[PDB]
Ligand binder design. Sequence first.
Ligand code: FAD
Ligand code: FAD
Ligand code: FAD
Ligand code: FAD
Lengths: 394, 394, 394, 394
Amino acid sequence: SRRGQEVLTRVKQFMKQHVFPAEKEVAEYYAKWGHPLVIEKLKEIAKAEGLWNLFLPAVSGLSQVDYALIAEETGKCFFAPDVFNCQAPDTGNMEVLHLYGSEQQKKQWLEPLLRGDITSVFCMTEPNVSSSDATNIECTIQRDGGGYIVNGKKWWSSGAGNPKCKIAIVLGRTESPSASRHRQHSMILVPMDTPGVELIRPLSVFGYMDNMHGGHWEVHFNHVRVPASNLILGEGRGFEISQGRLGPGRIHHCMRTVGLAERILQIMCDRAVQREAFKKKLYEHEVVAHWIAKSRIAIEEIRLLTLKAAHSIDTLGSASARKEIAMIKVAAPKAVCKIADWAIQVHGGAGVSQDYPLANMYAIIRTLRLADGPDEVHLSAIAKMELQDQARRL
Amino acid sequence: SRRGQEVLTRVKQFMKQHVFPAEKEVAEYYAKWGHPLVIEKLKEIAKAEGLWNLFLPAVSGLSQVDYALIAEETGKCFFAPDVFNCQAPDTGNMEVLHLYGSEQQKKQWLEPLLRGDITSVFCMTEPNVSSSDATNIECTIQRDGGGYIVNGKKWWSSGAGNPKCKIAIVLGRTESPSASRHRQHSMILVPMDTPGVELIRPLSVFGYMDNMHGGHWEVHFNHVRVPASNLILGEGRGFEISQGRLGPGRIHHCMRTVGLAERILQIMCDRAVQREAFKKKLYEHEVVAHWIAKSRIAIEEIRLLTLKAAHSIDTLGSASARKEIAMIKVAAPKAVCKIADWAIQVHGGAGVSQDYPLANMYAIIRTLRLADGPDEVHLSAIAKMELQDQARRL
Amino acid sequence: SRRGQEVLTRVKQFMKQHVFPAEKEVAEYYAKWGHPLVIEKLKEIAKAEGLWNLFLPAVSGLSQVDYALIAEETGKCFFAPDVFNCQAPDTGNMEVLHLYGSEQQKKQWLEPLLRGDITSVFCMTEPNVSSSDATNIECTIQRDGGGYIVNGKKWWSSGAGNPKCKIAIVLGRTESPSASRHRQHSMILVPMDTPGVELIRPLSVFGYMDNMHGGHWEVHFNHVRVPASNLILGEGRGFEISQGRLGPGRIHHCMRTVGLAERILQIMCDRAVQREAFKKKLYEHEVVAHWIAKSRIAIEEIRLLTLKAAHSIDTLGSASARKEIAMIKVAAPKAVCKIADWAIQVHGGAGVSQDYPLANMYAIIRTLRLADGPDEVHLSAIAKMELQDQARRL
Amino acid sequence: SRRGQEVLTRVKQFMKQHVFPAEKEVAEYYAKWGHPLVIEKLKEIAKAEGLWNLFLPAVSGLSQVDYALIAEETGKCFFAPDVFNCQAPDTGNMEVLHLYGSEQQKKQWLEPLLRGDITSVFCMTEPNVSSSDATNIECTIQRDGGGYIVNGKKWWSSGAGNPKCKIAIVLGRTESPSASRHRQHSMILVPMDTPGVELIRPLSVFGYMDNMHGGHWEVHFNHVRVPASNLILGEGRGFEISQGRLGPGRIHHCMRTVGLAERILQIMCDRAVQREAFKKKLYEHEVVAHWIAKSRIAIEEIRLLTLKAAHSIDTLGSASARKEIAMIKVAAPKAVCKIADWAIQVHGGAGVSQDYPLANMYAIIRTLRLADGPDEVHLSAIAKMELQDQARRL
Ligand SMILES: Cc1cc2nc3c(=O)[nH]c(=O)nc-3n(C[C@H](O)[C@H](O)[C@H](O)COP(=O)(O)OP(=O)(O)OC[C@H]3O[C@@H](n4cnc5c(N)ncnc54)[C@H](O)[C@@H]3O)c2cc1C
Ligand SMILES: Cc1cc2nc3c(=O)[nH]c(=O)nc-3n(C[C@H](O)[C@H](O)[C@H](O)COP(=O)(O)OP(=O)(O)OC[C@H]3O[C@@H](n4cnc5c(N)ncnc54)[C@H](O)[C@@H]3O)c2cc1C
Ligand SMILES: Cc1cc2nc3c(=O)[nH]c(=O)nc-3n(C[C@H](O)[C@H](O)[C@H](O)COP(=O)(O)OP(=O)(O)OC[C@H]3O[C@@H](n4cnc5c(N)ncnc54)[C@H](O)[C@@H]3O)c2cc1C
Ligand SMILES: Cc1cc2nc3c(=O)[nH]c(=O)nc-3n(C[C@H](O)[C@H](O)[C@H](O)COP(=O)(O)OP(=O)(O)OC[C@H]3O[C@@H](n4cnc5c(N)ncnc54)[C@H](O)[C@@H]3O)c2cc1C
């Protein structure tokens, strides 16, 4: 679309003018769970210029392909999505509140989230059970008179340490014997200021604490009392809302991963051209050149897959495109992990040190094979859908 | 396009009605370098219905995307491309004669090729040198008074054993010291009936002789006298014509390979559903299901890459899209080889026997990593182009 | 041992003097299920010099390490094991008859097998079921008065087309409700001259019929009447005898595969040194050199694994070393397959043709991942044993 | 040997009694470049019991196989080698001073190193050049009257931050036009207390600073004046001493890596047995079980390769076994990296957090593909030696 191209050009100009020059200051600030003043100034400027809430089609008037290209543009910096209010944790919560939810819930939580006043956290993983299977959730949401009681322990809650975090969406189980085997979980809105909500400890990733994004935390809900109006949809529709939330998050992460892979490839090519070993440059060795070629091929393939998934979501819907989302979720992280490992090996001993962003990049990409579900469950789902498709064809 | 969709539907109906039922008869006939009468009847029927010369846009009025889908449809059978006059050896020669060549050359050779009266063979590989580097060609094309003399030995000439083969395009070298380092080779039209042209022996592929397609032969040119009007373009433009010929052949092969991969995946899924081992079906074992999922992901990726290359050729040109062609040529054969190996392993001991087409399929796909240039030279070319692109960006 | 070293030196001299020069004649003879006179002369010479039955410790007085080195020596030729009476099909049957069996059975069948008068065939695979799980065998061995009745269809029976094949060992099931879940199968000796035994058709491997080794056949047993004295051990001990037969066959195949890999690596290095492409030799390209290095590393690793398994069998026994045999059976075929594929790619288009033995080599190695059980069942067995070992340690 | 077995049993008892229980205290101490008192007490106890300097055959009276098993035992803990005075940085310097060096140098530096009074650091890598090629070293060691002047910048110097570090071995270049192309570098002993030696900054590995081992530092030598008696051997023998130092370090690292891989496999098996997902345990999924089986196979292979290299060094010498050392250096890190990645994936999100040692383990193993030379230079060396061997055979 013409609007998509215009917004993409404006976003590229905004990044090249403001976002990249502030990287050194942002890194020096974090070398303690909030944002420095540079990010707030950038957010104000982006609000002024209209580069705000580009992820939500109902607000920005953009399709999934246009925002796919835009998110590919903003995936080259680790704090750029937060400048445009398109960061990973809160976007899913805004989508959940926009799709499902009452007028009171929207006016109370979605508007401050849209304006950037507050941030949100999504917590559904337990530390003592296998949470890749969503039926293993043991946190309870029991009705107690006129309200609800939330009691459980959470795990890997991203962004809970941010001082602006005021609302949470908690997935817990309700005992409903008369219901089906899937109508046993519900989502509830729990304010972080409610008595009984405790932040236990932050969680590290390969020795990185990720203070820029608020960190990952262990949260305890000790008999938290919540009004009955904070329950999203009904008392047994947690799985449906989770499925609705999942897809867009995965596609946005895949676009950002494509952008990050492009940045990594640029860095690796620069290093290969610059350095000389054994009386020749690094790219003159065929192994490095073949690494570069394979990286380019993989980047092109994953970008095409993500664009296909975005077009399918546009033309059909978010519920009739689960296979494409599963395929891109399987495909992107492994390819970008291989590219990052090749770049680290090309840079040598400096590839693991703090002189380059390759080590933190590798850690973040490595966590992409576990967050939002491991790759094995997605492979099983793809196999099941493919077998159903073959049975229908035959 | 609407015409593309209509022709695709007609082609699908034609295959399902005529081509697949004749597979058993065609296989029994070959269980000796020509075609049985069933193929000739199918060719006559296809000529009547207008499903003729679909590969050439100037004749069929189709873009590269429409024919990409059509060739994906016809890639599921090993003799289907010959039914529609879209077989690998002669298509490149028709493209060469259509792009370059005089009116006399066109009227003499392209029209019988277009009508299907005769077939052609392209020979540029020598047995005693490394022919992956085109500067190693030692066959000579010397001007002798009013004509030319062709003297050399050829290698892996596909389709030379067909009785309908009457014309050849031979790549040889001419001694031109005043010319550049690339203007040393030329292409000449050599009729197979010329004295001095000898067929030495056929060449086998993993123990398969491939009599259906005319086989692969060693050809000797012993002082062949050829008129000066049989030289295509000039006396030093062999490389340019070779580059013009190369790309469309690769893209058509990639589309047919995608179709073959789809057929292989269907066979493997059928076997996995049917068989039971260790008190469960084969797909109930997670390794087989993950094989199926990875095969589907790879098929989708290679199809998207081929469609991207076809669209780029449509919108820009065959000379400004070499990078995409190189990427698809690298990507498709390895993925389809892995899929075929997985299918053979799934079928067990019967995966290598004559009860299934998987072994011949694997042999043919394995030769795709060597024919039309190995994968390593393409990887080097991709690396060079990517480095140039990075230098231009920086 | 000193005897092992002396026999190894004598075997090396015998190969270099007689076996390699006859390769061209043997190949020309087969370019129809028996042996040419050259092989018979070589067998007579080997009998005269005492290089006979080197595989059996009770006859040759050699341990498993000495014969491991000897079989590594004889693995470089495809008919060399038959010169020393150490070929794959009959060796297992000799081991079975030597370990288990009565005096009458030994005097009737093992002595002609030891002298080389007759050959044997082992058949336990069915065409219409999954035979990787041995409980799926549907062939019946019912007691009928004073004898037994064998009724079933066999599959992939190696060596059944040899005119010297006179005896077979057939695995079938007996209905014994009072027995356990494993005491349901038995092995019986069935002469090939018995009425009701039919050879149906030979089976091809990638288009190779393997006439040198007698081929692989489909055999039908149509109500074959057999005396009760032809039953090995008891009526429900088939699994035990099968387990006893399995291990030595696998270790001998692994040693021969190591030898074949060494030959393949020598051929590939010769080609890489000889040829020149793009103004440099093939080994001057780093990819080819890295292929060579990885091939050498893999060869060393698999040889060490096989020697470890042989020493373990020597010092402990064939029943307390199943884990090592499973590991070598998993490890050797994949590494040698990768080496063969690299060599084929190095040779170029000639790597698939009949000018070199690489294509037939690849086909034979590819069948090693399916014969004597697939790799997946061995991986599952290794995982089970490793979990038991960890539980015992903890 | 009997002594080797007795010392191995004593070492196993010592570890199980003292080293493992202190892991929690050691971890809590570091959660600042020296050792806590627990390690010093363990060192005193090990000195009392005679488990001291087990790496040096001239002191312990042990071969390379016995110490290979012992180092495999001590590779399961990250501070265990330091308890027995067998830690990576100083062992190479002790070997260098033991092989080469004068009586004064030995009495001054080797004896305090042997008794554990001081530690050493080896520095030969420069930050601004490619140091994988040893001819790129730009640090200068110029003779200045009665002594030497060392001027250069070092990089990744391990253990320089330890307060006990008093001596260094620096590799620099000397301008000798009359000498050969390899006699251009020399090794000199530089005390850390000499004026002009500066510690610039520590270097991180994936966000880990590794304070336990003294860290990795950037060191500057600003016109350091050193007496002429501190030069090891001559003024142009740096390469020879470097080659002598290299091999034993690699073999010890490989043995410790095998031990670490065994520990990782034990942890992964424990997790797979414990956890349950999708109504079954983790090992009941075939992918996890196949991961376990492949890990066991790889561990066995690398252990056999290391033992073969140790036996070859014992029976022939450290100069006629470079091929085996290169092969093990290539083989061990990649296999252990794959095993560690599989274990991290098995543990899920907790695989990257601080609750388990898998993330730090992966970082340390990942640096093993770069330290002591990258894998690509070793692959090139192996290819060269293999080509020489093939040429000699032919
Ligand atoms: C944990 C750790 C500890 C260390 N400790 C020490 C220490 O105590 N002392 C010390 O002196 N150094 C130490 N180092 C440094 C280490 O020795 C070097 O990083 C390594 O030798 C390579 O040096 P470099 O960084 O200059 O690599 P570079 O040469 O700059 O890397 C270029 C890359 O190109 C590739 N390459 C290079 N040559 C070839 C070729 N011929 N063919 C193909 N590809 C090729 C490789 O992937 C290589 O990594 C340590 C490093 C680490 C990570
Ligand atoms: C060259 C050659 C020679 C042979 N010679 C003989 C001979 O002399 N005698 C004889 O009796 N047989 C012989 N065979 C047959 C051979 O033993 C069988 O092919 C093999 O044992 C598997 O039998 P199948 O074909 O029924 O495999 P199937 O069970 O039908 O194959 C199914 C596939 O599923 C997979 N699979 C199976 N179980 C599992 C599991 N638990 N987990 C995961 N994946 C699994 C495997 O990939 C397997 O290949 C020969 C075969 C070949 C190729
Ligand atoms: C089924 C089939 C059909 C064919 N049909 C035809 C036909 O119709 N017409 C025709 O002219 N030819 C045909 N060929 C031949 C084919 O084009 C050649 O085999 C191919 O181009 C390579 O030629 P070569 O055998 O000389 O390879 P070689 O150059 O001899 O192979 C050397 C090997 O070295 C490697 N290598 C080469 N260059 C590099 C590099 N720069 N970097 C790294 N590695 C490198 C590659 O692995 C290559 O295979 C056919 C081949 C097959 C298998
Ligand atoms: C950086 C990061 C951020 C995160 N942020 C959040 C967040 O904001 N909110 C949140 O709720 N969670 C978050 N998580 C947690 C994440 O969602 C979980 O780690 C993940 O969903 C798996 O949960 P688990 O740890 O219980 O895995 P487990 O189930 O304990 O892992 C077991 C392992 O077994 C394997 N496996 C599982 N099922 C199968 C199967 N069917 N077939 C084969 N293999 C299988 C997989 O390898 C899996 O990793 C985050 C995690 C990370 C690393």
